[PDB]
């Protein structure tokens, strides 16, 4: 259509973004960056809808232009910045630090973390191959490339990053029985640590996941993100820890806390 | 009557993070007016039809009084 579309009408924005229908006619188009458009969340949304920190969108930019916000490190003042899954949003003011993790319903939730935990982050390696003058590199979910990785570091494995510098410290692997996090479809949010993989040469290897509730489910490989050892994660999980409460289960215990 | 409001840690913070229409709704920012939006739009086009300062052309307009 002659080029790049730089707008985003409402009702076209991701549903997990939780945007009210009548708020004018357009949504904020996420920018180009580390995370895929349909697989991200921008700062305007975070600072306005999720945290209710800014009333208008006009105020959000006033907030950012003071370098108050930083993500995974640097300031990152792009109002439409595509902050994605596992990113770390620190905040000079309020001492707050946040990690971007989903719910079991599939949306990004507000999850505060320790100043200690804000120093690291993980990433699902999406590609590994040699490059410039024979030096191998790794590229992952993040959208960052790390030179000189360990020869055992294969694809689809998670990795821990310092974020003060670039080099990684630990690298979990995609082996039977490792903590996983589903990011894809709407099984997204469920967690459970591996059942087994169906290769299916030609494409779309499938992963079998068993939550720690004796409940099975399946998803596609590029949707699973290993996070560690059974019961032993590598990051602070959110409330409910992804176990797919049924509609009746959540309503029952919704009426459980009955008296004020 | 339900509403919404806010108090600042100073007035210099309010006068800088607060919308100007509010500052004038209070009387802490003057209401000095500006010409109608369509008027200045027309002025913009009127100005685009001129290339340069426009000071050296009044010369020829007033210089063709002979011709």
């Amino acid at each position: 259509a002659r080029g790049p579309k730089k707008h985003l009408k409402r009702l076209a924005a991701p549903h997990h973004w939780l945007l009210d229908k009548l708020s004018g006619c357009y949504a904020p188009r996420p920018s180009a960056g580390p995370h895929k458009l349909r697989e991200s969340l921008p700062l305007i949304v975070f600072l306005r809808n999720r945290l209710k920190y800014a009333l208008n969108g006009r105020e959000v930019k006033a907030i950012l232009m003071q370098r108050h916000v930083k993500v995974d490190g640097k300031v990152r003042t792009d109002t439409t910045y595509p902050a994605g899954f596992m990113d770390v949003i620190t905040l000079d003011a309020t001492n707050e630090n946040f990690r971007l993790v989903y719910d079991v319903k599939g949306r990004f939730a507000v999850h505060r973390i320790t100043d200690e935990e804000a120093s690291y982050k993980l990433g699902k390696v999406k590609k590994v191959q040699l490059g410039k003058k024979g030096v191998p590199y790794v590229v992952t979910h993040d959208g960052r490339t790390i030179r000189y990785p360990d020869p055992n570091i294969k694809v689809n494995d998670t990795v821990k990053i310092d974020l003060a510098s670039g080099k990684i410290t630990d690298f979990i692997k995609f082996d039977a029985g490792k903590l996983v996090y589903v990011t894809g479809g709407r099984n997204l949010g469920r967690i459970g640590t591996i059942v087994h993989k169906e290769r299916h040469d030609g494409g779309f290897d499938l992963v079998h996941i068993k939550d720690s509730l004796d409940n099975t489910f399946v998803t596609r490989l590029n949707n699973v993100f290993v996070i560690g050892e059974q019961g032993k994660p590598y990051i602070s999980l959110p409330k409910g820890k992804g176990i797919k409460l049924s509609i009746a289960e959540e309503r029952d215990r919704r009426r459980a806390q009955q008296g004020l | 009557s339900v509403g919404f409001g806010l108090v600042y840690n100073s007035v210099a913070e309010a006068k800088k993070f607060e919308p100007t229409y509010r500052l004038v709704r209070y009387g802490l920012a003057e209401k000095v007016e500006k010409a109608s939006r369509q008027q200045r739009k027309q002025k913009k086009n009127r100005d685009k039809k001129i290339f340069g300062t426009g000071k050296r052309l009044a010369k020829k307009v007033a210089r063709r009084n002979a011709d």
Partner: protein, 179 residues
């Protein structure tokens, strides 16, 4: 370019338009509950039939089907929540039988009169519309309130209304002060 503000209508209409039996019944119902247009009856028949095909649909589901239970107890819960379906009839086989009149007697112009205080269903409607009677301080002029059976305890007039009194009233102050 902007989201479509959803809408829907609340009143169906009988196919046969000149059935004298149903017409006579309809009229007495209107004249009894204080209705003004017969369509406030057509309306109640509409939501009724909707609830009925929503229940009757689940009634052929294999007994105890998960969504059947969830939405079944949800439906009975909100019906008792308003006070139309008796508490003994909480297993939904009686929801197919909620005769229309049960809904009407659970309106607000109806209760405003039933707990005395209006001495006519028409005086009731007139008062509800004239700045009078509230639940708390929440004045309500919608005679089709559909009181929830719990807010049914607090129906005393609002503070303002010069009928439980806050002032004499506009026509009174002068009907008497015109000397």
């Amino acid at each position: 370019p902007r989201a479509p503000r959803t809408y829907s209508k609340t009143y169906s209409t009988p196919k046969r338009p000149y059935e004298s039996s149903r017409l006579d019944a309809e009229l007495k119902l209107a004249g009894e509950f204080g209705l003004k247009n017969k369509k406030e009856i057509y309306r109640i028949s509409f939501q009724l039939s909707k609830i009925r095909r929503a229940a009757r649909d689940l009634l052929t589901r294999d007994e105890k089907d998960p969504k059947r239970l969830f939405e079944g107890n949800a439906l009975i819960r909100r019906l008792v929540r308003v006070g139309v379906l008796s508490e003994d009839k909480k297993k939904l086989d009686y929801v197919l039988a909620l005769k229309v009149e049960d809904f009407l007697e659970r309106r607000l112009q109806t209760q405003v009169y039933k707990l005395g205080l209006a001495k006519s269903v028409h005086h009731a409607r007139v008062l509800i519309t004239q700045r009078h009677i509230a639940v708390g301080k929440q004045i309500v002029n919608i005679p089709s309130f559909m009181v929830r059976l719990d807010s049914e305890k607090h129906i005393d007039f609002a503070p303002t209304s010069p009928f439980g009194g806050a002032r004499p009233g506009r026509v009174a102050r002068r009907n008497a002060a015109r000397k």
